Amino acid sequence: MDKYLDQFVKAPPAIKFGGLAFVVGALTAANFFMVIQPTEEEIGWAVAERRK
Amino acid sequence: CEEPPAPAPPPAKPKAAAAVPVKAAPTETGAQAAPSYSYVYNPVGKRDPFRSPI
Secondary structure (H helix, E strand, O other): OOHHHHHHHOOOHHHHHHHHHHHHHHHHHHHHHHHHHHHHHHHHHHHHHHHO | OOOOOOOOOOOOOOHHHHHOOOOOOOOOOOOOOOOOOOOOOOOOOOOOOOOOOO
């Protein structure tokens, strides 16, 4: 149903915006993981300190 | 604040926790002695006196 692989092979504003959006989604996934990891590390330092 | 118990890792009271138990003090103090005991005593006696005078 053709004109849509023509549009899917092409792009301009809708897909520039789209790509920006997938990128910012990836970056937010990354920073959320990069705030989950200091949590685990922090619980670890807790377990060490209490053992001291 | 901290709740009934706190949250779960436990939180943090391994460090508060551990470098407590307790105050310590430590009250490096109030000891008790066995003392020690001396020993007794050197003789056999000798006679001059008192054999003649009794």
